[PDB]
């Protein structure tokens, strides 16, 4: 991640700015923190999918299943 890696810190800068400047308790900066939490949520969704990164078998049997390393004749 590089794009959302930057964009979360950009929205964090905006969270420091817009909710100290244009009203700490209103719909605008609540929308700002809601946006930053959604950016954080997609960081979480990226994080969990990279935790589930397979090493080899769900790659080499993803592309070429019938090799002898992963034939399964579940019989």
């Amino acid at each position: 991640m590089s794009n959302l890696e930057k964009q979360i810190e950009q929205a964090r800068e905006e969270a420091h700015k817009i909710c100290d400047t244009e009203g700490a308790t209103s719909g605008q900066c609540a929308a700002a923190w809601d946006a930053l939490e959604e950016l954080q949520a997609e960081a979480a969704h990226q994080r969990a999918e990279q935790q589930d990164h397979k090493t080899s078998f769900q790659q080499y049997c993803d592309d070429n299943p019938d090799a002898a390393e992963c034939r399964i004749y579940d019989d």
Binding site: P65, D66, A68, E69, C70, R71, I72, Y73, D74, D75
Partner: protein, 337 residues
């Protein structure tokens, strides 16, 4: 006449081809296309000289690099691993016989339907809700618009007629099975790297156990027993034939002679050609090439406490399973829509 094709010219494919060469005259099926990962020179040799069924004798087998002449009958042949680049509409293919052990999903098997084939019969217990059909149990109840049908595994294809007979005659509460299975091609020969660890070990040396869901496929083909049938498998160093143990817990009590009588008359009325009944003291290698999909071994049937039955069934998972595949293919040819 229905133009049919074979995906994957392995054990099931070679046995399917040999069966159709032995059942040619009564066939609405003409085999017109095969594809393996080998060249057409090699697999013709592997068809003619099977180290399990001996040398083929009835018809002449030869090939060149584009076609295979089996007994004067020509058959086309190609080689590709992508199912999407395959000449199906160029060859006019109604039914393709999926036998690679790769395309078990609906989305995998439907690639042939997309690439220009009309129906696909997959010889594996498929992932997902693919309609499964066993000859002798529910080969009637398929809708002919179901173009993607699945035959189950060989163990299920053996076990389910016996379970049908015992469920109709006695009623089944629960049931276990433990099939002593011949070694298949998926196991590595020496101890080599493999996705499952118990199949990674040597095949000629070991009783390797494995967990299978093919007992649960009886609960698919018989709906009122789903979630009540489960069992494991034992792969032992025999190359061809196998036996399945089956422990059921019936509720209508009986003795060991009566279940043998029930299956003996069911062998002669309804399951004729499916279940053979043998009161001989045979052993495994006397069932290489038997036509029935289950030979009930009579002398070993036993009942404890009236409500607990055990049968054992010899079955050939390379020849009889191919016979049931070809019978299902002809039976879907007879009700083509």
């Amino acid at each position: 006449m229905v133009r049919v094709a074979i995906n994957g010219f392995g054990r099931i494919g070679r046995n399917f081809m040999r069966c159709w060469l032995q059942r040619k005259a009564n066939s609405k099926l003409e085999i017109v296309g095969i594809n393996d990962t080998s060249d057409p020179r090699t697999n013709a040799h592997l068809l003619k000289y099977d180290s399990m069924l001996g040398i083929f004798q009835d018809a002449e087998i030869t090939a060149d690099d584009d076609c295979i002449y089996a007994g004067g009958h020509a058959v086309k042949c190609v080689s590709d691993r992508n199912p999407e680049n395959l000449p199906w509409s160029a060859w006019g293919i109604d039914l393709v016989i999926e036998a690679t052990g790769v395309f078990t999903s609906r989305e995998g098997a439907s690639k042939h339907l997309s690439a220009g084939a009309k129906k696909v019969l997959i010889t594996a217990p498929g992932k997902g809700n693919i309609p499964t059909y066993v000859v002798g149990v529910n080969h009637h109840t398929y809708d002919p618009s179901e173009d993607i049908v699945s035959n189950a595994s060989c163990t299920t294809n053996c076990l389910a007629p016996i379970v049908k007979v015992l469920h109709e005659a006695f009623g089944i509460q629960q049931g276990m099975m433990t099939t002593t299975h011949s070694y298949t091609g998926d196991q590595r020969l020496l101890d080599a790297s493999h996705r499952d660890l118990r199949r990674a070990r040597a095949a000629a040396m070991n009783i390797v156990p494995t967990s299978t869901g093919a007992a649960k496929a009886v609960g698919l083909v018989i709906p009122e027993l789903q979630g009540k049938l489960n069992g494991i498998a034992l792969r032992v160093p025999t190359p061809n034939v196998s036996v399945v143990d089956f422990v059921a817990q019936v509720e209508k009590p009986t003795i060991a002679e009566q279940v043998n009588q029930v299956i003996k008359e069911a062998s002669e009325t309804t399951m004729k050609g499916i279940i053979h009944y043998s009161e001989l003291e045979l052993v495994s290698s006397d069932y290489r090439g038997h036509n029935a999909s289950s030979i009930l071994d009579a002398s070993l049937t036993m009942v404890l406490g009236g409500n607990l039955v055990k049968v054992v069934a010899w079955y050939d998972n390379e020849w009889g399973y191919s016979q049931r595949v070809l019978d299902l293919a002809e039976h879907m040819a007879a009700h083509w829509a």
